[PDB]
Fold Kelch-like ECH-associated protein 1.
Amino acid sequence: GRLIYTAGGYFRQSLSYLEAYNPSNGSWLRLADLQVPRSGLAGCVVGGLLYAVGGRNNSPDGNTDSSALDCYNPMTNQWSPCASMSVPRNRIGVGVIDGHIYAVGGSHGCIHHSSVERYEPERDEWHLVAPMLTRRIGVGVAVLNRLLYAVGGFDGTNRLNSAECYYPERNEWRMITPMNTIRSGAGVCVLHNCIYAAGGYDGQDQLNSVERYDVETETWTFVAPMRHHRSALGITVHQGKIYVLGGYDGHTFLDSVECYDPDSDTWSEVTRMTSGRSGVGVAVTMEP
Ligand SMILES: Cc1ccc2cc1[C@@H](C)N1Cc3cc(ccc3OS1(=O)=O)OCCOCCn1nnc3c(C)c(ccc31)[C@H]2CC(=O)O
């Protein structure tokens, strides 16, 4: 894996862009568009292939929540459809455990899901697993030590500071320590032994604060805030650093890409996306 891929997003309407950033030389490549423009989707990688999951096609012709799973192969620069999920999931969170994709929460119209389902690429099948204890849309999801975490979000009435963990061998969800901040549409990732929650929306403001959950201590601690307040940001980890892409700051759909170095506890601007956007799906895989 060597490029940071950003798929979809929103700027005036849902986007079909697939673009890839090379941290080693600062270059951006524009690759094959998604077959359907989608915002509020998630991206992930299994076996070197990039998957785009869920989202919504917000267009002048009609708004449709997506149950789609599409696969991009960097060796061919082509997207291929996969089996669709049981239900549409806009503002979804996804995590990968042992080659399986877990699709978590998200919305279908006014329905805010607590349901979760798992995709097996070798069978091209989805199956429902135990639902979360809380309905969550705009939920951040990360995997640490083969355990799946669902962080923050919106339950249909309130934005959440709560978080929960899924234990696959017990098919059970249990609440973990809540975050110090309410966050919906935060960027959630894993770095070292911690789950980071960056930015998001608390129901009033877009946030620049960043906190991390240490799974051995069960505590959330704030780290250095980002240079920009961002909600509905893309996030990924590459070579021990967190990269945040775009998002909305309450005024502009950002093109800013910042990088967090955990050793210095500093955020730096590293590049700008080709255009400002929010609600993207991000993941790292081999160059095309
Ligand atoms: C992916 C995603 C996750 C979480 C949220 C929204 C979205 C969707 C709707 N994206 C964010 C977005 C934002 C936008 C237009 C399109 C758009 O499309 S998108 O990029 O796919 O305009 C923002 C105008 O400010 C409203 C206040 N605000 N700021 N951040 C917000 C967020 C994060 C949510 C809700 C309201 C938010 C939350 C939902 C909530 O808490 O209710």
